[PDB]
Design a protein around this ligand. Structure first.
Ligand SMILES: [Ca+2]
Ligand SMILES: [Zn+2]
Ligand SMILES: [Zn+2]
Lengths: 20, 155, 451, 145, 48
């Protein structure tokens, strides 16, 4: 299960930039 | 010492008379040479640098040229031993200073590592090196090179 | 006992330092042999070495053991051949900075550098200038910044404060004889300086490279395939391939911008196809099995990035025939523009970034050769001027301006004496002690000075 | 030697066409573009092979269920069941395929590998037939200059 | 072509002065002359 979760896990780190 | 055909009859007889011959007809050439060549080397180096200074600071002098004709026999031994550091000494005066170069110093300089480091230094100094720090980094490179040279010498 | 083992460990360390490159090449050959005998595997979910009449299965294990051992020998010889030199450079830089700039005194370093912050716990230790062939740097800096700041406020962060007080006190009639107890020198050795030394070593790139080497060599025992990563040592360790690899690693950023632009253009083509070419992405096998379609943005983007880039003829050769009405011309534009913009002018950029780098390195080499062959390194007069006396320039660079002669002169000045220098020697020594270097011939020589 | 062997077999007279290059210097301006570098070419062939060997061992360790070049079905052949065979398959097909190696292998639709094999194939393409043939082509173009 | 343009610009700004256009070699007779010339005598900022 890696065709779809990679981009989601890559963007889940930029939530710390979305909050600021 | 007579088969090399370098010492004439007088020189041969002098070196035989200068032998220890302490009733045993045997000589310890180690101490012999370390006594008769070690200070001779230094004093000959001093006379050679004196003559080189005189030749370079008094040309067109036949009265000195005829002296150089008899002095090259000992002046040639110290050719890879005298340096020419052309420094700026007194105001607007290019002074040629001389000094002694040890045999180990001229031995540890021809190693491939130091030569390759010097080549890389020249490369990355000609390409991206500045003008305000060219001598500053040349002296820093010189210090690094001599430190690594002592390190390779004490091993 | 202690002397006979120290005089032996010193010889062993000298052997390991003298034979660093030899053991390096030997480890390289051992890795070559391991990877060549790795060419004899088979499968039986089970990897089996059944391809010969023995003598190949145990030799792989013994060669892996020997390779790890010789790699350990390399990691202990590097620490004895190259680490003193890098710590000498570090100490030299930090000491000059302190003495001539007042780094940790008046111009405290910022947070954008780790060297300026990691060289802080070494200025306050006892044996700070361990490899600088002098220890009178602290003396210089208090004498330079003793009156302009707190005389004790300087020695509080440069160490030896209580030590200097005790030394000034012991100058009177109070001095004992220090004893020496065997097997109890751990307190004598400086632990903070050694911690800083290891912190500097663990930052040295060339040491981390060997550490990664050790990691892969150790993992090679848990699995006999990490010995393939040791072939990268023929490039990252030996500089025999730099002329070739310096063509790809010279540009750098330009390549990442190219991969960051090609992907955007392919994404534009992908969204255009998703919006206008539904009835084309029909990679069905045997008929009536629709798959690899454009029913998903990520799937279509992956299909593009995987097939249209590597297809060699754009993307119009892996898709249906554009015979449908209202699209016969739009899809022609789409495919031919993809071809001309993706695999024609975006691979040309990469190929020019690789072809121009060869020219750039060659031009750098020729410029270096010309500047060393047309000018002098010290005075920088020129080659043409010296070619008035028969064979003048090479004699000039071998007798008058030999870099080796300057190196021997600096060593002679440092190692001769202090009160026995002549006028010129003392003059040059005072400038070298003050670090100005106007005694180097700037634009004049003994030949330009006279006739 | 070749002219004499031409009598024992009437095909060694083809080696005499090399005399238009090695004897007459009319082709030196062109052939001096390949024979000028020299060592650089052998280092390139000595580096490309190492990179292809790395890709081969990676495939042998992670892509068993892909090298299935069967004809007519249920005839497994040209697989990765041998290191030398897989290395030869790579060196013979993936280099000359013109589109990397991902066009001569199965579709990377399998789970846990859908992304790893994408990286494998696209990196092989970008590192083998893009920046290792560019080196050879620049060694040939720079020599003219 | 772009690389050659950049090198020509860098050479003309590093070998000549923008205002007088004498040359870099002439000013390199006093120790470290050209940069002092372009920072004190012919600074574009000073003219502005
Ligand atoms: Ca004196
Ligand atoms: Zn010169
Ligand atoms: Zn000007």
């Amino acid at each position: 299960m890696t065709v779809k979760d990679m981009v989601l896990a890559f963007f889940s780190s930029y939530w710390s930039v979305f909050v600021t | 010492m007579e088969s090399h055909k370098h010492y004439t009859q007088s020189e041969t007889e002098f070196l035989l008379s200068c032998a220890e011959t302490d009733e045993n007809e045997t000589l310890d050439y180690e101490e012999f040479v370390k006594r008769f060549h070690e200070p001779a080397k230094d004093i000959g180096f001093n006379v050679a640098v004196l003559l080189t200074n005189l030749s370079e600071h008094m040309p067109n002098d036949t009265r000195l040229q005829t002296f150089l004709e008899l002095a090259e026999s000992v002046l040639n031994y110290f050719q890879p031993f005298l340096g020419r550091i052309e420094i700026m000494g007194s105001a607007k005066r290019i002074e040629r200073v001389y000094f002694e170069i040890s045999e180990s110093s001229r031995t540890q300089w021809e190693k491939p590592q130091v030569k390759e480091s010097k080549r890389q230094f020249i490369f990355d100094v000609v390409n991206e090196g500045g003008e305000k720090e060219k001598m500053e980094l040349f002296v820093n490179f010189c210090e690094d090179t001599i430190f690594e040279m002592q390190l390779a010498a004490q091993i | 006992f202690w002397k006979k083992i120290i005089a032996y460990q010193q010889k062993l360390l000298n052997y390991f330092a003298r034979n660093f490159y030899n053991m390096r090449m030997l480890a390289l050959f051992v890795a070559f042999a391991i990877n060549f005998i790795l060419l004899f595997y088979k499968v039986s979910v089970h990897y089996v070495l059944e391809e010969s009449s023995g003598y190949m299965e145990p030799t792989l294990r013994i060669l892996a053991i020997l390779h790890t051992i010789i790699s350990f020998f390399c990691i202990i010889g590097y620490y004895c051949l190259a680490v003193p030199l890098v710590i000498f450079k570090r100490e030299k830089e930090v000491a000059r900075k302190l003495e001539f700039d007042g780094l940790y005194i008046t111009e405290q370093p910022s947070e954008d550098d780790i060297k300026g912050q990691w060289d802080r716990l070494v200025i306050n230790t006892q044996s700070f200038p361990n490899n600088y062939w002098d220890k009178f740097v602290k003396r210089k800096v208090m004498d330079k910044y003793g009156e302009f700041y707190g005389r004790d406020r300087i020695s509080e962060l440069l160490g030896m404060d209580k030590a200097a007080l005790d030394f000034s006190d012991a100058r009177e009639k109070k001095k004992p004889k220090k004893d020496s107890s065997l097997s109890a020198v751990l307190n004598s050795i400086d632990v903070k300086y050694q911690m800083w030394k290891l912190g500097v070593v663990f930052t040295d790139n060339s040491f981390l490279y060997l550490a990664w080497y050790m990691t892969m060599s150790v993992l090679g025992h848990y699995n006999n395939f990490f010995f393939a990563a040791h072939l990268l040592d023929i490039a990252m360790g030996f500089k025999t391939l730099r002329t070739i690899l310096s063509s790809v690693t010279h540009n750098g950023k330009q390549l990442v911008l190219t991969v960051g632009l090609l992907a955007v253009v392919v994404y534009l083509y992908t969204v255009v196809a998703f919006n206008f070419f539904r009835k084309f992405y029909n990679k069905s096998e045997d008929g009536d099995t629709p798959d690899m379609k454009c029913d998903d943005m990520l799937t279509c983007y992956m299909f593009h990035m995987y097939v249209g880039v590597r297809a060699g003829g754009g993307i119009g050769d892996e898709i249906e025939d554009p015979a449908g009405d209202e699209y016969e011309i739009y899809r022609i534009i789409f495919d031919i523009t993809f071809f001309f913009f993706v695999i024609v002018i975006l691979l040309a950029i990469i190929q020019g970034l690789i072809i121009d780098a060869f020219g750039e390195l060659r031009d750098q080499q020729e410029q270096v050769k010309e500047d060393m062959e047309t000018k002098c390194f010290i005075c920088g007069i020129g080659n043409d001027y010296f070619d008035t006396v028969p064979h003048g320039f090479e004699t000039h660079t071998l007798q008058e301006h030999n870099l080796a002669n300057y190196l021997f002169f600096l060593m002679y000045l440092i190692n001769k004496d202090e009160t026995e220098h002549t006028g010129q020697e003392s003059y040059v020594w005072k400038m070298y002690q003050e670090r100005c270097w106007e005694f180097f011939p700037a634009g004049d020589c003994f030949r330009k000075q006279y006739e």
